[PDB]
Design a protein around this ligand. Structure first.
Ligand SMILES: OC[C@H]1O[C@@H](O[C@@H]2[C@@H](O)[C@H](O[C@@H]3[C@@H](O)[C@H](O)O[C@H](CO)[C@H]3O)O[C@H](CO)[C@H]2O)[C@H](O)[C@@H](O)[C@@H]1O
Ligand SMILES: [Cl-]
Length: 413
């Protein structure tokens, strides 16, 4: 018998790493495990096409936020037996457990594979030279703005580029998701959707959510984000941080591993940023401190010919040995709570900060219509970034854009 698994590029050699991870399972169950690697760019499409055609792999990886959508199409096997077999609900963070099913469904459709959440990477050299205490800059919004002001003013020059560093690199194209903006919405006491008397509605136009977005977008108006960044996406900003063009930017724990690996295998060990890398959690806003908590689950398609064998593989990948090994190869965090206690995570100081940030990780409701709701949100936010490009953003103009987003989102639900 043979299994097919579809994954995303979770590690630098993503196929090789997965083949090594499941070698003991291949040997132990006497089976070959064919893996196919989909860019995040087109994974939504390949997976959805397998769901409607009823042709594809036994297992697929899923972004946490996609489980509701795929579940609702009626193409996923229940996996209660696999979750029970791994310790059930108590074995996982509640922000991870939320993403095992369609919101409000009897049965689980996804087994948690790994987690990732966002924190600030910073240049320890740049902050030291501007006399900014990282604990102070990342403690509060007031601290954050004050650090960027000191960072804008500093004479410091990257020793490779001999040029300044821009204080903050954040993208301001159309976002593809609200991963970058959600923490500011949450930090201010806001949220994207509110569950009121059974149905969900937009909360993007609440006073608290508009104070969060406007704080985030206002950092660009105050010139802590350079013009050219308002034309870039997350990948090109990662390049800019790695290349010594900016002091601070938000990403997931993969950059820690990327810093120990040389330029010629997708890493940045050779760069000044790699020998001067700090990490801090999102600053606390008025109503507290939050980051985007996501990652990926594995799902079994209900048309698989190899269901027994494929649930065995799910028990394996979802369980303690495989959870530790995959996390070392990817730089992600294990989805299984137990497996965080491994020495290999406790002795990396930068990873400790992401492990701590997990307590303030927030996720989205696992909704059939989530992707639609995020598209309306980011399309309207994108027109607020256009106002920033022009130096014309106001609280009024942002309220008006989020009111149109809200009216569309209430409809979509
Ligand atoms: O919104 C869909 C889905 O997004 C997922 O977040 C991913 C990021 O994790 C991913 O980041 C890449 C790393 O996973 C990869 O290993 O390294 C590269 C570069 O070294 C990173 O870009 O990037 C994609 C966009 O390219 C994001 O979608 C979330 O985990 C999940 O919660 C969500 O459902
Ligand atoms: Cl954004």
């Amino acid at each position: 018998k043979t299994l097919e698994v579809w994954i995303m590029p979770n590690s630098p050699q993503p196929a090789e790493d997965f083949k090594a991870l499941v070698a003991p399972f291949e040997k132990a169950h006497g089976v070959e495990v064919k893996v196919t690697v989909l860019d995040w760019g087109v994974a939504w499409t390949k997976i959805t096409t397998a769901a409607t055609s009823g042709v594809g792999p036994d297992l697929t990886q899923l972004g946490t936020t996609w489980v509701g959508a795929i579940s609702a199409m009626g193409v996923l096997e229940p996996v209660d037996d696999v979750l029970e077999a791994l310790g059930g609900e108590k074995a996982y963070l509640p922000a991870v457990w939320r993403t095992t099913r369609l919101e409000g469904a009897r049965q689980a459709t996804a087994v948690p594979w790994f987690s990732e959440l966002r924190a600030f990477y910073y240049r320890t050299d740049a902050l030291k030279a501007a006399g900014v205490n990282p604990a102070e800059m990342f403690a509060s919004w007031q601290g954050f703005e004050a650090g960027l002001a000191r960072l804008k003013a500093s004479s410091f020059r990257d020793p490779e580029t001999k040029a300044p560093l821009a204080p903050l690199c954040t993208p301001g194209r159309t976002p593809r998701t609200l991963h970058n903006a959600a923490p500011w919405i949450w930090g201010a006491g806001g949220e994207i959707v509110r569950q009121a008397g059974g149905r969900w509605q937009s909360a993007l136009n609440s006073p608290e959510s508009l104070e969060g977005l406007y704080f985030f977008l206002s950092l660009a108006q105050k010139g802590y984000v350079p013009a050219e960044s308002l034309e870039k996406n997350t990948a090109q900003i990662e390049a800019d941080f790695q290349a010594g063009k900016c002091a601070v930017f938000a990403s997931g724990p993969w950059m820690i591993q990327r810093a120990q690996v040389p330029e010629a295998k997708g890493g940045f060990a050779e760069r000044t940023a790699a020998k001067n890398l700090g990490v801090a959690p999102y600053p606390a806003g008025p109503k507290g401190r939050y980051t985007f908590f996501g990652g990926s689950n594995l799902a079994l398609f209900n048309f698989s010919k190899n269901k027994p064998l494929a649930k065995e593989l799910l028990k394996y990948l979802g369980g303690p040995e495989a959870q530790v090994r995959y996390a070392q190869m990817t730089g992600m965090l294990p989805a299984l709570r137990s497996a965080w206690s491994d020495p290999s995570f406790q002795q990396n100081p930068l990873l400790r900060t992401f492990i701590q940030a997990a307590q303030f990780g927030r996720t989205y409701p696992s909704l059939a219509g989530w992707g639609g709701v995020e598209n309306l949100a980011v399309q309207h936010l994108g027109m607020a970034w256009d106002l920033v490009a022009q130096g014309r953003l106001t609280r009024e103009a942002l309220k008006d854009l989020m009111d149109k987003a809200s009216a569309a989102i209430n409809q979509a639900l």
